[PDB]
Amino acid sequence: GPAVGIDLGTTYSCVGVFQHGKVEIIANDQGNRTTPSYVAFTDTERLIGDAAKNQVAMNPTNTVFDAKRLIGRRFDDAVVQSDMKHWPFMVVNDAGRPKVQVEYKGETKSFYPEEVSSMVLTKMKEIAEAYLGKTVTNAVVTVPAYFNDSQRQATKDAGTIAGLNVLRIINEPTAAAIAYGLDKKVGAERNVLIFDLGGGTFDVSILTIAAGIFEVKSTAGDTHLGGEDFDNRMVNHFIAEFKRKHKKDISENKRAVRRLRTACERAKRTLSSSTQASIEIDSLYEGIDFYTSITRARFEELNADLFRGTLDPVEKALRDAKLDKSQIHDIVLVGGSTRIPKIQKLLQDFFNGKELNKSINPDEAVAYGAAVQAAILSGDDVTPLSLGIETAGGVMTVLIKRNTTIPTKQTQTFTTYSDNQPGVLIQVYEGERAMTKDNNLLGKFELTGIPPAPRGVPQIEVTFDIDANGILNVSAVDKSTGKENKITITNDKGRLSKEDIERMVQEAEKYKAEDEKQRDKVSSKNSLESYAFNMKATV
Numbered sequence: 070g071p072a073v074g075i076d077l078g079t080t081y082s083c084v085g086v087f088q089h090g091k092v093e094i095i096a097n098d099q100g101n102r103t104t105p106s107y108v109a110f111t112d113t114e115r116l117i118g119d120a121a122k123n124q125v126a127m128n129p130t131n132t133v134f135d136a137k138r139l140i141g142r143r144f145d146d147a148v149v150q151s152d153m154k155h156w157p158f159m160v161v162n163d164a165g166r167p168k169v170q171v172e173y174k175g176e177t178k179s180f181y182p183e184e185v186s187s188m189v190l191t192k193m194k195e196i197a198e199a200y201l202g203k204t205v206t207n208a209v210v211t212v213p214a215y216f217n218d219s220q221r222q223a224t225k226d227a228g229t230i231a232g233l234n235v236l237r238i239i240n241e242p243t244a245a246a247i248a249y250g251l252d253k254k255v256g257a258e259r260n261v262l263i264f265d266l267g268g269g270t271f272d273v274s275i276l277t278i279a280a281g282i283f284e285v286k287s288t289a290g291d292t293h294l295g296g297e298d299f300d301n302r303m304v305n306h307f308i309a310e311f312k313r314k315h316k317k318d319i320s321e322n323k324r325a326v327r328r329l330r331t332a333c334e335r336a337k338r339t340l341s342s343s344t345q346a347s348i349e350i351d352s353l354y355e356g357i358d359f360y361t362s363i364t365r366a367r368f369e370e371l372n373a374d375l376f377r378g379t380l381d382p383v384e385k386a387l388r389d390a391k392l393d394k395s396q397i398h399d400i401v402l403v404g405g406s407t408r409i410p411k412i413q414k415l416l417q418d419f420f421n422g423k424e425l426n427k428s429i430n431p432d433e434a435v436a437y438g439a440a441v442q443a444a445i446l447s448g449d450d451v452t453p454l455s456l457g458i459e460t461a462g463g464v465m466t467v468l469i470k471r472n473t474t475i476p477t478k479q480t481q482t483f484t485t486y487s488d489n490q491p492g493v494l495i496q497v498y499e500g501e502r503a504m505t506k507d508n509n510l511l512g513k514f515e516l517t518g519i520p521p522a523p524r525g526v527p528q529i530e531v532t533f534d535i536d537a538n539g540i541l542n543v544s545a546v547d548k549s550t551g552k553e554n555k556i557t558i559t560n561d562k563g564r565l566s567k568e569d570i571e572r573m574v575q576e577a578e579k580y581k582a583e584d585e586k587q588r589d590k591v592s593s594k595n596s597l598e599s600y601a602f603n604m605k606a607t608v
């Protein structure tokens with residue numbers, strides 16, 4: 070049958086299907102297009118989704134949430150340890166592997182984070198099956214771009230337990246871009262900033278999209294910032310107001326705080342579309358009815374630090390991506406909290422008036438992209454890789470960047486690394502990695518007869534030329550004598566598939582921090598040696 074796209078989120082999960090040329094976000098039993106990522110254990114039954122969240126106050130100890138925070142992690146991690154403080158459910162050490170302890174049918178039961186996530190995936194699969202009328206096995210599950218291999222594997226394992234065959238694990242920012250069809254946009258290297266403000270998590274990702282290939286240049290955000298924090302500021306304000314107006318603290322009564330929180334959540338939604346919102350609660354504390362109103366401006370004032378702090382991760386992502394704000398070509402809003410007008414104004418003003426892509430429901434965009442990717446996997450002139458030469462230390466120095474329109478001619482000047490160097494070896498490589506060993510060797514040629522001189526004085530000009538056919542000609546000239554040597558590298562049709570380019574870009578993303586340190590180690594950027602570093606029998 071048709072494959073489904075699943076957004077497994079920390080607070081909420083969404084499932085979508087591409088059928089008859091259209092993506093449909095599938096509603097649950099209660100008519101909700103988003104299902105809470107909550108699993109509840111009771112003396113008689115196991116509850117998943119909205120039902121679990123509705124009874125959380127009654128059974129906090131046995132209601133589980135924020136499993137995505139523990140997936141593919143270790144009990145020792147500071148994140149795990151810090152998070153446990155705010156969780157009513159028990160997290161226990163099992164040989165350093167985090168597991169949740171709950172009471173189920175009178176037996177204490179412990180479950181892995183992937184097991185809890187599998188139960189959420191089971192509900193999403195069931196929601197899809199009820200809508201489709203057919204069993205759904207194939208699925209594409211999304212993960213945060215910063216997730217490591219163990220977290221991604223743990224997510225795939227959760228689907229495997231659920232009975233789903235996970236065709237691919239894809240980044241949530243990449244899924245949002247696919248939903249907006251940024252990949253299908255014409256041209257070269259569009260830079261995309263995904264601004265994701267969920268209920269409990271904030272993510273900012275910069276992606277460069279070129280010829281259908283996505284590269285995650287940078288990631289930034291706050292794992293503990295979301296819409297709930299905005300609700301908390303409103304709740305604290307109203308508790309203070311009641312204490313001033315009626316001289317009572319309602320914080321003692323759990324039900325009173327819960328009723329106020331629900332009113333604050335409804336008011337925040339109203340404030341997204343209206344200037345003011347009304348709070349009406351009967352007998353909130355000691356029989357006193359609380360009837361009051363809040364303006365959008367007061368809501369903005371209560372959350373001013375949180376709203377403006379959103380720009381700081383955007384600034385860090387731009388610095389890590391080494392891009393100016395002007396170089397961003399597309400901005401995508403993901404998450405319900407992005408509906409807030411102040412957040413949109415702060416981002417648009419920071420980007421000097423740039424339009425924001427908000428057209429697809431922010432809560433459903435990641436699932437929408439996952440569904441398009443699932444369909445593509447199921448039935449449903451530019452340069453592919455960076456081209457460069459090896460510099461001293463086996464470093465890759467790029468002369469032609471990936472996705473550069475062809476024909477192109479690029480020239481750089483290099484020097485000897487050793488005193489009285491007789492010659493230089495020009496080694497041509499293809500790849501996105503800092504070291505040539507991690508890149509592909511295309512050809513090598515030798516320039517010799519260099520006049521004896523101190524290191525840094527001989528000048529060797531290397532030129533890369535691509536005739537429109539795509540044939541690469543690499544030439545080196547000794548500037549002192551005019552002596553030259555060149556290699557012609559044939560472009561075989563089908564040498565690289567789309568997957569081959571994707572794997573090498575994904576490898577560069579996985580090792581970006583380590584790759585940067587290797588670039589920092591060599592003092593001179595363009596010094597050339599007379600030997601292949603990869604074939605040296607040292608270290």
Ligand SMILES: O=C(O)CNC(CO)(CO)CO
Nearest residue numbers: 078079241267270403404435
């Ligand atoms: O909360 C998260 O896990 C990430 N946020 C999204 C919800 O899953 C996914 O991108 C969208 O807000």
Ligand SMILES: [K+]
Nearest residue numbers: 076077211212
């Ligand atoms: K997801």
Ligand SMILES: [K+]
Nearest residue numbers: 265270271272
């Ligand atoms: K997020």
